[PDB]
Design an enzyme around this catalytic site. Structure first.
Site, PDB file in Angstrom:
ATOM      1  N   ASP C  43       0.829  -1.193   0.000  1.00 49.73           N
ATOM      2  CA  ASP C  43       0.000   0.000   0.000  1.00 49.73           C
ATOM      3  C   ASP C  43       0.872   1.255   0.000  1.00 49.73           C
ATOM      4  O   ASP C  43       2.064   1.220   0.315  1.00 49.73           O
ATOM      5  CB  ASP C  43      -0.929  -0.004   1.213  1.00 49.73           C
TER       6      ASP C  43
HETATM    7  C1  LIG Z   1      -0.950  12.821  17.800  1.00 49.37           C
HETATM    8  C2  LIG Z   1      -1.714  13.847  16.962  1.00 49.37           C
HETATM    9  C3  LIG Z   1      -3.150  13.441  16.557  1.00 49.37           C
HETATM   10  C4  LIG Z   1      -3.433  13.486  15.032  1.00 49.37           C
HETATM   11  C5  LIG Z   1      -4.885  13.134  14.588  1.00 49.37           C
HETATM   12  C6  LIG Z   1      -5.019  12.382  13.228  1.00 49.37           C
HETATM   13  C7  LIG Z   1      -6.442  11.829  12.875  1.00 49.37           C
HETATM   14  C8  LIG Z   1      -6.486  10.424  12.183  1.00 49.37           C
HETATM   15  C9  LIG Z   1      -7.872   9.953  11.636  1.00 49.37           C
HETATM   16  C10 LIG Z   1      -8.217  10.414  10.185  1.00 49.37           C
HETATM   17  C11 LIG Z   1      -9.210   9.513   9.403  1.00 49.37           C
HETATM   18  C12 LIG Z   1      -8.869   9.273   7.921  1.00 49.37           C
HETATM   19  O1  LIG Z   1      -8.443   8.215   7.535  1.00 49.37           O
HETATM   20  S1  LIG Z   1      -9.134  10.654   6.717  1.00 49.37           S
HETATM   21  C13 LIG Z   1     -10.380  10.242   5.371  1.00 49.37           C
HETATM   22  C14 LIG Z   1      -9.956  10.791   3.988  1.00 49.37           C
HETATM   23  N1  LIG Z   1     -10.531  10.110   2.817  1.00 49.37           N
HETATM   24  C15 LIG Z   1     -10.031   8.927   2.274  1.00 49.37           C
HETATM   25  O2  LIG Z   1      -9.050   8.412   2.809  1.00 49.37           O
HETATM   26  C16 LIG Z   1     -10.703   8.310   1.049  1.00 49.37           C
HETATM   27  C17 LIG Z   1      -9.765   7.534   0.085  1.00 49.37           C
HETATM   28  N2  LIG Z   1      -8.451   7.261   0.684  1.00 49.37           N
HETATM   29  C18 LIG Z   1      -7.243   7.485   0.000  1.00 49.37           C
HETATM   30  O3  LIG Z   1      -7.356   7.924  -1.143  1.00 49.37           O
HETATM   31  C19 LIG Z   1      -5.861   7.184   0.682  1.00 49.37           C
HETATM   32  O4  LIG Z   1      -4.905   7.681  -0.201  1.00 49.37           O
HETATM   33  C20 LIG Z   1      -5.583   5.671   0.916  1.00 49.37           C
HETATM   34  C21 LIG Z   1      -6.536   4.822   0.085  1.00 49.37           C
HETATM   35  C22 LIG Z   1      -5.776   5.395   2.398  1.00 49.37           C
HETATM   36  C23 LIG Z   1      -4.075   5.277   0.503  1.00 49.37           C
HETATM   37  O5  LIG Z   1      -3.807   5.702  -0.722  1.00 49.37           O
HETATM   38  P1  LIG Z   1      -2.431   4.995  -1.717  1.00 49.37           P
HETATM   39  O6  LIG Z   1      -3.052   3.672  -2.078  1.00 49.37           O
HETATM   40  O7  LIG Z   1      -2.314   6.015  -2.823  1.00 49.37           O
HETATM   41  O8  LIG Z   1      -1.280   4.954  -0.733  1.00 49.37           O
END
Ligand SMILES: CCCCCCCCCCCC(=O)SCCNC(=O)CCNC(=O)[C@H](O)C(C)(C)COP(=O)(O)O
Ligand SMILES: CCCCCCCCCCCCCCCCCC(=O)OC[C@H](COP(=O)([O-])OCC(O)COP(=O)([O-])OC[C@@H](COC(=O)CCCCCCCCCCCCCCCCC)OC(=O)CCCCCCCCCCCCCCCCC)OC(=O)CCCCCCCCCCCCCCCCC
Ligand SMILES: CCCCCCCCCCCCCCCCCC(=O)OC[C@H](COP(=O)([O-])OCC(O)COP(=O)([O-])OC[C@@H](COC(=O)CCCCCCCCCCCCCCCCC)OC(=O)CCCCCCCCCCCCCCCCC)OC(=O)CCCCCCCCCCCCCCCCC
Ligand SMILES: CCCCCCCCCCCCCCCCC[C@@H](O)O[C@H](CO[C@H](O)CCCCCCCCCCCCCCC)COP(=O)(O)OCC[N+](C)(C)C
Ligand SMILES: CCCCCCCC/C=C/CCCCCCCC(=O)OC[C@H](COP(=O)(O)OCCN)OC(=O)CCCCCCC/C=C/CCCCCCCC
Ligand SMILES: CCCCCCCC/C=C\CCCCCCCC(=O)OC[C@H](COP(=O)(O)OCCN)OC(=O)CCCCCCC/C=C\CCCCCCCC
Ligand SMILES: CCCCCCCC/C=C\CCCCCCCC(=O)OC[C@H](COP(=O)(O)OCCN)OC(=O)CCCCCCC/C=C\CCCCCCCC
Lengths: 128, 103, 88, 459, 178, 603
Positions: C43
């Site tokens: 990935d």
């Molecule tokens: C310590 C400090 C705290 C920080 C807080 C952080 C909060 C974390 C929680 C956020 C929730 C989420 O996932 S945020 C939700 C955002 N939307 C999506 O993820 C839809 C499609 N996903 C993608 O396109 C990605 O790229 C992916 C497929 C994963 C890989 O891609 P590759 O295949 O190109 O590597």
């Protein structure tokens, strides 16, 4: 939910917290594309003038010339007497002078009175 | 994602040129060509030219120029305790009032 | 300092070491030029974790723009050699 | 006194009868010899003065200024030798002639037993400076700068001539010795108030006072290096010398009269030191620093106490040397960069280490680091002001801090950081420039061994 | 730093950058290795839950909301590598980085030492003089009309050609010159 | 003749010889640092003799050798005071500098400008000797400014780094803020007492007024980095580790406390200034310890420890115990300098890593630095019979056995707790856990220079307190009787801090994570003081300096008033007068008008 971060003048809004970036439109994409096009044209011109072997001198920067000229020589010809300009100029150019004159005049009047009545105890004061 | 083929080729050429330049930056065994032309033992000379000589000047300058003028060097008038005797006069300070000594 | 002058062989050896301790990849199938997306079925998140491991291994961190377009161990070694000015 | 004046006059035929490629060598050597001759005047008495004749006298306020004026000419010649290289022999000879005439006028100005002779020479110094500024100037605003410099001076000084002739009509003499021995109090009258203003404003404009300081940035920025040197080192001190000479007649009117000026200078030093913080120009920054220092000198003269006068003399000498050095450094940068803006050429310590050392020493001596004579004058004036009023120190405090800031700012913007990538015409510093900086800086560190030599007649 | 930037950042670039920042700040929070590993795997698992989501509006809702959470718990004093733009040795050796053209100003008595280096430098100067003259034409013909759109340079395409605008990229002083 | 003067001037004189030889050929070789180190060591072993003479007799002296300018009644001369403070502080400073240069020969082995570094160090040492031995206020100001300028130069050692230049300018700014009060004190003393000499000032000031003491306190706060002007000391860690170990830890930063000690006859006769000094010291030590207990950079933690110790020193001054504060200065020099030696050894061994998050097991991986840091932490905390115990225990007893503020005493006790807290924090996060550094292990100590330099200060931090306390004459009334619980207050507070901070750090291994609170954020960002105070005033100044001073008044209104108005008026008058169409009709009508007006007006 979490407590909200409130931006200020000296602590601006974070790059990733701007509501504007998530609102994407074709017009915004075109604007960013033309911005980067201008930036790349300027970069190309600078590198073309930079890499050349023949050149042996400082590269002149029209942006710096404009900055310095606007800061120094373009102020007065663009001045207009305005209530804001008049009041700010009068305050910042007269008020401190009269304030300090009042302070020093009062101090020296008090000292002169104290020396007239003589209750000042100027013993060992020989250098002035 | 990843590098485009043109990016790959440009990086390869720039990188090989960079290695050639870096390799060219090395020195040969004769590179620093130095032209020669002129016109307890360690601690013995140093303790003389850095300690013995400076104290000779300062002691001479103090004993003979600074102390020539009045009030330039002023001492503490060291403490006088009962029972002591003074060389200049020879008298002895009388002892104390023989307080009761216990514990 | 007293830091030994690391070379391309040492860089590549340490890269392959870190990749073989990555249990998501069986060690006998990977190679120097083996791709990450297709040759190993990893990935993009796995690739950025590989970037994490590289940064924690070599003591310096790669900018995100360059990191997100690194898909082979060989090109990673080449990039890190360019950063560290490695001769051989 | 003619043993100094006649060689200075002979400098002109020697220059004009010189071989086409030996003018600089001849001029520098004979200027240094004349400077050596000027050193004899330094051995002053605790008594009245060194009255050579009816026309010229010497004083321990006049002697350091005369020595500095003589010493400045070889430095100005060495600084001007660079940018006048592609110039015809006749015009170089004219430039040297103008410098020699300026020195002669200053020398006659500083001795000047009589006030009308002093005024005549004080205004005679104006023509060579104006011609140097408006002729061998680079930018197109040198004409406007020359107009400003001429007209500020003349507007200030025209009432002074009327006041002087009136004073001679009433008293009967304009001689300094007669005036000092026959001084009488001035009644607090409107006519006396205007006479005081006419006597003071002419010297106030040349310091210059904070209200009237506009001509100075223009004149300093647009003048060549020799012009900037002579303006910052000697021409600004003429106002202070004139005030110290003319203030004797003014009392007891000075106490009431001094307040507008004291307030203007105490606030203007802060204003100009703060202006220095936000500047895009080296020459303008040095000019504003000079304005701040001369505002402090104005405060010292207006307080009119012995410590004030000693501090003012020491500060004038120290500021002259320091500002001349700073302008020389800025000109060395400009001759390579041709931009005269701080933010363009950066990180010059990496490329020119010895020149960076010179920059550091100049910025430290502008910062008034002890036991330099800069801080000697600084501290004497500050103590006198504190005795005058315990609140002045606060303003003085701010000034000191602000001064240090911009000084190190000028040291950090141009010498520290990363060198601009594009500039490649930064050649190694020449022996001439290093000698110029050494000859600027060594007299300061020699004078700090013998401060009384520059502390004036009230020592 | 080496590659040219893009006109914008895609959604996947933003989520990857957020993942990187969050994982680095969690490593800063979790000093010990086992605790960091456990919490990083917990965070990775949480992150992967919304991976197959197809709604773009929902996709916009995701991550940006997470960014606010990241900003709340961002460890005000994170770990920074020593040479990074926030590190304690970020620009320690920039004062030792002297340009190459300075060697053109050396005295001949100084150039008497290191003669082989200056001979190789002369060969480099000859190569640059020829290659730049070729590169000017190559870039003029390859550049799109109306000015470039992206600040990326094309590679060399002939046999004797060199990469355009190569002199100041190849001739960097060093990372640690002294 | 009485070799006290000759020796005590010879030490300072021979301290200057390498500066003279800096233009010689030895400066261009690799033997210059060893030359400087040998010179410093010989200066120390030569200055040990006047210390012995003082211990035997109590011999005191003033040497006014060169006569500088004399203005009227006042006389200025090159005068050196060799009192107990000078003859006691000089050997300690020279020993610390010897150890620092021995360490720096190894720490700066790869620095191209190492001779210049050594030269910079020697110049700072000479200037501090001038400051310590000064008898008049002008020489003391000379040293005061010289140490500040050398600190500015050494902080920005790597001038290609923007943050180093920023930190150096910060130090200069705060030192000038203190310089304001210094100059106020000098002016007041000259005007009222008629002299800058120490003897005259003491004699003519039986009941010193508020103003000179307030100026002295402002200068001391500026140079000792008190709460009002603290951030420059933590920000000064940008310089090389030897610079932080010599200047900003043990020799330079005690300049304000030393200055307040110098004027103790006038300090004891005023009660308000003593209260201000006590409160300032207490708040400074509390705030700095509170900031320290939560930092990740080891250098920042130890610098905050130094600032807290300076606050404790001014607490000692405020309760009218100057000699005990001097003893604290002397002991703190030893152990805090050795603490920075240990920290720099760790940083160098971990490839210039300063964060404690990337250092784990070093108790066995590197043992000599381990035992040295353990002994230093024990001495800082105050272990009975250790170097720290002789000074800090008496500090606690005197503060407790005095008519002082209750709040100041409470804050001092809490500061002791927090001192124990960050000491055990350093030990735990650098020495006990599993390794966290990069896999390529470059850990090495087998170098004679580092080992010898550390072990010399180890012997010092073990035996100096004992030998010095039992060799110096008694100078104050002891608290010979004391409640048993109040005698053990320092030890119980230290042990409580140890145990509580150890327990709080031991919970980090637990597999549970929670977001931080407001107190942690407040303590980690340094009370938010460096943020606001470094963004709100400066901007508000700089903007004004461009908007009001530069453009509004100078470029516009001052230009509008005199020159532009004159130009406009003269232009209008010239246009009006010269605009005549050339018609003699109008000219002669005007002639008739003026003729009749003259006939009607002038007779
Ligand atoms: C310590 C400090 C705290 C920080 C807080 C952080 C909060 C974390 C929680 C956020 C929730 C989420 O996932 S945020 C939700 C955002 N939307 C999506 O993820 C839809 C499609 N996903 C993608 O396109 C990605 O790229 C992916 C497929 C994963 C890989 O891609 P590759 O295949 O190109 O590597
Ligand atoms: C201290 C005692 C000294 C005794 C020995 C005699 C020393 C004489 C030195 C005379 C000054 C040098 C000449 C001025 C310009 C520099 C000349 C030069 O080109 O050098 C190249 C030469 C070789 O350079 P390079 O390696 O080729 O180039 C490298 C790069 O350029 C990179 O260069 P760099 O980075 O190496 O820069 C050089 C170096 C040094 O270079 C300089 O900055 C020179 C200027 C320093 C002072 C700045 C003005 C401040 C006002 C001080 C006024 C003092 C006047 C005293 C009388 C002076 C008489 C001349 O930088 C510094 O060290 C900064 C020093 C800041 C000092 C701050 C404290 C000042 C007050 C100290 C107390 C003084 C009175 C004490 C009285 C009470 C006790 C007796 O380097 C030197 O010679 C350095 C000299 C050593 C430093 C001296 C610093 C103190 C001097 C104070 C004045 C003399 C005091 C005498 C009584 C002392 C007791
Ligand atoms: C008379 C009888 C005598 C006996 C008295 C009783 C004996 C002892 C009883 C114990 C009493 C409390 C001792 C425990 C202290 C708390 C430790 C703790 O749990 O921290 C974790 C906890 C939060 O940890 P976290 O956020 O999860 O951090 C994440 C990791 O732990 C991140 O961790 P990390 O790895 O990054 O670093 C760990 C670090 C990080 O931990 C911290 O965050 C430290 C921050 C809190 C500890 C500082 C306590 C010092 C208190 C002095 C405050 C002076 C007044 C300030 C005024 C502020 C005004 C707003 O923790 C430490 O290194 C150790 C902390 C210091 C403890 C050692 C010494 C403390 C004992 C001495 C206290 C007093 C006894 C004096 C002895 C003499 C006998 C009289 O801290 C707290 O919950 C705070 C508790 C107390 C704070 C008081 C301030 C509250 C202010 C609210 C507003 C009040 C109204 C103001 C109105 C004003 C308007 C004008
Ligand atoms: C622009 C940059 C700066 C330029 C230089 C500025 C400095 C020059 C300003 C002159 C300072 C003040 C001039 C006169 C001061 C006299 C004292 C007076 O102010 O106090 C009262 C005077 O009251 C009033 O001030 C009367 C005068 C009012 C008219 C003056 C105009 C006021 C503002 C004008 C300022 C413009 C100056 C620039 C002109 C181009 C005292 O009352 P009184 O006891 O009765 O008079 C005592 C004097 N006697 C004994 C001779 C009779
Ligand atoms: C900015 C400078 C400060 C300006 C302050 C005031 C500005 C407004 C004044 C404008 C010009 C006014 C011109 C008329 C003034 C009349 C003054 C006067 O006549 O006093 C002369 C007085 C007494 O007169 P008598 O009749 O002889 O005495 C017998 C009876 N007792 O005698 C004298 O002292 C003569 C001295 C000449 C006075 C100077 C006149 C000019 C104004 C003074 C200078 C101030 C302006 C300087 C300009 C600054 C530009 C850099
Ligand atoms: C060196 C090589 C020669 C070595 C052999 C000779 C050793 C010294 C013998 C010389 C005889 C003594 C001597 O020098 O005579 C005194 C003579 C001074 O003459 P005085 O009359 O006493 O005072 C000045 C007014 N007349 O002494 C000296 O000046 C030489 C030594 C003086 C101290 C050295 C200078 C150190 C400080 C430098 C200046 C620093 C700034 C000023 C200090 C600020 C203090 C507020
Ligand atoms: C009673 C009358 C008193 C008259 C006092 C006259 C003061 C001397 C200044 C005379 C200037 C008047 C002429 C003028 O300024 O013309 C506008 C002119 C236009 O330039 P030109 O080359 O002529 O051509 C432009 C179109 N191509 O504007 C300028 O250039 C002005 C530049 C220099 C400004 C000089 C400022 C002088 C005034 C300073 C203060 C002192 C003034 C004298 C009285 C002060 C009162 C005490």
């Amino acid at each position: 939910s979490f407590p909200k971060y409130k931006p200020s003048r000296l602590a601006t809004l974070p790059a990733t917290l701007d509501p504007a970036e998530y609102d994407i439109s074709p017009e915004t994409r075109k604007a960013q594309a033309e911005r980067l096009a201008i930036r790349s044209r300027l970069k190309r011109e600078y590198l073309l003038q930079y890499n050349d072997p023949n050149r042996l001198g400082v590269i002149e920067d029209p942006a710096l010339i404009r900055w310095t000229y606007a800061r120094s020589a373009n102020i007065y010809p663009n001045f207009r007497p305005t209530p804001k300009t008049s009041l700010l100029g009068a305050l910042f150019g007269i008020g401190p002078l009269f304030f300090w004159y009042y302070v020093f005049k009062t101090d020296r009047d008090k000292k002169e009175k104290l020396i007239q009545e003589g209750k000042l105890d100027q013993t060992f004061n020989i250098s002035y | 994602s990843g590098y485009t083929p043109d990016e790959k080729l440009r990086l390869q050429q720039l990188r090989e040129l960079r290695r050639r330049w870096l390799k060219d930056q090395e020195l040969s065994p004769r590179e620093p060509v130095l032209p020669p032309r002129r016109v307890t033992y360690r601690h013995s000379i140093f303790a003389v030219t850095h300690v013995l000589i400076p104290v000779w000047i300062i002691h001479y300058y103090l004993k003979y120029h600074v102390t020539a003028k009045p009030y330039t060097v002023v001492e503490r008038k060291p403490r006088i305790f009962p029972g002591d005797t003074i060389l200049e006069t020879g008298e002895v300070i009388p002892l104390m009032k023989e307080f009761p000594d216990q514990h | 300092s007293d830091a030994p002058p690391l070379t391309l062989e040492a860089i590549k050896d340490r890269v392959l070491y870190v990749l073989k301790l990555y249990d998501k990849i069986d060690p006998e199938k990977l190679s120097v030029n083996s791709h990450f997306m297709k040759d190993l079925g990893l990935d993009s998140l796995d690739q950025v974790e590989i970037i994490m491991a590289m940064e924690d291994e070599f003591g310096f961190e790669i900018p995100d723009i360059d990191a997100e377009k690194l898909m082979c161990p060989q090109e990673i070694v080449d990039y890190i050699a360019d950063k560290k000015d490695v001769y051989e | 006194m003619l043993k100094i004046i006649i060689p200075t006059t002979m400098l002109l035929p020697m220059t004009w009868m010189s071989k086409h490629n030996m003018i600089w060598i001849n001029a520098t050597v004979h200027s240094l010899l004349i400077s050596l001759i000027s050193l004899s005047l330094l051995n002053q008495l605790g008594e009245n003065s060194l009255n050579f004749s009816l026309t010229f006298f010497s004083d321990s306020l006049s002697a350091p200024l005369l020595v500095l004026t003589t010493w400045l000419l070889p430095l100005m010649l060495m600084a001007s030798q660079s940018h006048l290289s592609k110039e015809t022999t006749t015009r170089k000879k004219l430039y040297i002639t103008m410098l020699i005439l300026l020195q002669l006028f200053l020398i006659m100005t500083f001795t000047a037993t009589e006030l009308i002779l002093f005024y005549i020479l004080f205004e005679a110094t104006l023509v060579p400076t104006l011609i140097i500024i408006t002729r061998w100037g680079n930018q197109t605003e040198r004409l406007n700068a020359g107009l400003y410099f001429l007209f500020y001076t003349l507007a200030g000084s025209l009432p002074l001539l009327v006041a002087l002739v009136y004073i001679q009509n009433t008293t009967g003499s304009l001689n300094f010795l007669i005036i000092h021995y026959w001084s009488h109090p001035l009644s607090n009258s409107w006519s006396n108030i205007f006479m005081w203003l006419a006597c003071i404003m002419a010297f106030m404009v040349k310091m210059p006072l904070y209200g009237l300081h506009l001509w100075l940035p223009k004149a300093h920025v647009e003048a060549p290096i020799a012009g900037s040197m002579v303006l910052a080192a000697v021409l600004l001190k003429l106002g202070g010398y004139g005030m110290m000479r003319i203030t004797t007649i003014l009392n007891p009117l000075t106490n009431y009269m001094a307040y507008p000026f004291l307030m203007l200078s105490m606030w203007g030093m802060i204003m100009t030191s703060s202006i220095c913080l936000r500047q895009t120009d080296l020459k303008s920054l040095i000019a504003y620093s000079s304005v701040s220092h001369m505002a402090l000198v104005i405060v010292a003269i207006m307080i009119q106490t012995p410590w004030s006068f000693m501090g003012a003399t020491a500060l004038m000498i120290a500021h002259g040397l320091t500002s001349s050095m700073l302008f020389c450094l800025a000109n060395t940068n400009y001759e390579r960069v041709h931009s005269r803006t701080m933010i363009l050429a950066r990180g010059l310590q990496t490329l020119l280490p010895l020149m960076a050392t010179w920059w550091l020493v100049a910025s430290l001596t502008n910062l008034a680091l002890p036991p330099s004579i800069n801080l000697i004058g600084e501290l004497f004036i500050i103590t006198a002001s504190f005795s005058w009023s315990n609140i002045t120190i606060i303003l003085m405090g701010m000034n000191m801090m602000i001064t240090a800031l911009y000084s190190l700012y000028m040291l950090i913007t141009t010498q520290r950081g990363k060198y601009t990538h594009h500039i490649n015409n930064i050649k190694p510093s020449f022996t001439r420039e290093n000698a110029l900086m050494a000859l600027h800086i060594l007299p300061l560190l020699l004078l700090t061994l013998n401060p009384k030599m520059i502390l004036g007649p009230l020592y | 730093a080496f590659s040219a930037p893009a006109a914008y950042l895609t959604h996947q670039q933003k989520v990857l950058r957020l993942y990187k920042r969050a994982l680095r700040h969690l490593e800063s929070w979790c000093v010990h290795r086992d605790k960091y590993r456990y919490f990083a795997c917990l965070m990775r698992a949480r992150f992967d839950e919304h991976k197959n989501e197809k709604d773009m509006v929902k996709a916009t809702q995701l991550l940006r909301q997470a960014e606010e959470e990241f900003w709340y718990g961002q460890h005000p004093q994170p770990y920074i590598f020593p040479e990074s733009p926030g590190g304690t040795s970020y620009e320690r050796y920039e004062c030792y980085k002297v340009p190459e053209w300075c060697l053109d100003d050396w005295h001949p008595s100084e150039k008497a030492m290191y003669p082989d280096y200056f001979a190789k430098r002369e060969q480099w100067k000859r190569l640059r003089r020829e290659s730049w003259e070729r590169e000017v034409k190559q870039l003029q013909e390859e550049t799109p009309p109306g000015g470039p759109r992206t600040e990326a340079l094309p590679p060399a395409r002939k046999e004797g050609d060199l990469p355009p605008l190569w002199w100041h990229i190849v001739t960097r002083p060093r990372e640690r010159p002294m | 003749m009485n070799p006290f003067a000759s020796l005590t001037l010879t030490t300072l004189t021979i301290l200057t010889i390498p500066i003279m030889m800096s233009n010689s050929n030895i400066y261009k070789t690799n033997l210059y640092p060893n030359y400087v180190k040998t010179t410093v060591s010989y200066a120390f072993t030569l200055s040990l003799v006047p210390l012995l003479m003082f211990m035997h007799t109590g011999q005191e002296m003033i040497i006014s050798n060169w006569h500088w300018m004399t203005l009227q009644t006042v006389e200025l001369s090159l005068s050196f005071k060799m009192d107990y403070f000078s003859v006691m502080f000089i050997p300690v400073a020279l020993f610390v500098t010897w150890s620092i240069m021995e360490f720096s020969m190894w720490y700066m082995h790869s620095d191209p400008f190492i001779n210049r570094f050594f030269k910079y160090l020697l110049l700072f040492l000479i200037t501090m000797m001038i400051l310590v031995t000064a008898n008049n206020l002008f020489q003391l100001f000379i040293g005061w400014e010289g140490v500040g300028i050398m600190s500015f130069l050494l902080i920005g050692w790597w001038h290609g780094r923007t943050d180093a230049n920023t930190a150096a300018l910060q130090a200069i700014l705060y030192n000038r803020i203190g310089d304001i009060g210094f100059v106020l004190s000098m002016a007041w003393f000259l005007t009222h007492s008629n002299a800058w000499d120490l003897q005259q000032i003491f004699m003519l000031n039986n009941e010193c007024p508020n103003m000179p003491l307030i100026g002295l306190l402002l200068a001391a706060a500026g140079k000792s980095a008190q709460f009002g002007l603290h951030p420059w000391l933590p920000s000064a860690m940008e310089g090389p580790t030897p610079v932080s170990a010599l200047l900003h830890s043990s020799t330079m930063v005690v300049a304000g406390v030393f200055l307040l000690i110098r004027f103790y006859p006038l300090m004891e006769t005023n009660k308000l200034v003593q209260t201000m000094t006590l409160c300032l010291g207490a708040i400074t030590t509390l705030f700095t310890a509170l900031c320290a207990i939560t930092q990740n950079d080891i250098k920042k933690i130890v610098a905050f420890s130094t600032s807290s110790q300076l606050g404790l020193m001014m607490v000692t001054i405020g309760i009218n115990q100057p000699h005990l504060a001097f003893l604290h200065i002397c002991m703190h020099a030893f152990f805090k300098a050795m603490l920075f030696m240990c920290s720099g050894s760790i940083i160098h061994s971990l490839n210039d890593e300063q964060d404690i998050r990337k250092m784990g097991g070093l108790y066995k991986a590197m043992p000599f630095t381990t035992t040295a840091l353990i002994i230093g932490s024990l001495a800082l905390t105050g272990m009975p019979y250790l170097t720290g115990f002789y000074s800090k225990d008496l500090i606690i007893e005197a503060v407790n056995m005095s008519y002082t503020n209750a709040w100041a005493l409470l804050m001092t006790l809490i500061a002791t707790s927090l001192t124990a807290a960050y000491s055990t924090r350093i030990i735990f996060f650098a020495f006990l856990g599993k390794p966290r550094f990069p896999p390529l292990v470059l850990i090495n100590e087998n170098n004679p220079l580092l080992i010898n330099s550390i072990k010399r200060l180890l012997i010092g931090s073990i035996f100096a307190g004992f030998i010095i306390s039992n060799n110096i004459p008694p100078m104050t009334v002891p608290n010979t009787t004391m409640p048993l619980y109040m005698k053990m207050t320092a030890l119980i507070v230290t042990i409580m801090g140890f145990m509580l901070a150890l327990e709080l750090n031991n919970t980090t291994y637990y597999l549970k994570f929670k977001y931080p609170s407001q107190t942690y954020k407040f303590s980690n960002m340094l009370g938010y003081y460096p943020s606001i105070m470094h963004r709100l005033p400066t901007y508000h100044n700089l903007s004004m300096s461009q908007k009001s001073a530069s453009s509004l008044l100078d470029l516009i209104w001052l230009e509008t008033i005199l020159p532009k108005t004159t130009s406009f008026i003269q232009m209008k008058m010239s246009i009006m007068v010269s605009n005549q169409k050339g018609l003699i009709k109008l000219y002669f009508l005007s002639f008739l008008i003026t003729i009749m007006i003259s006939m009607t007006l002038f007779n």
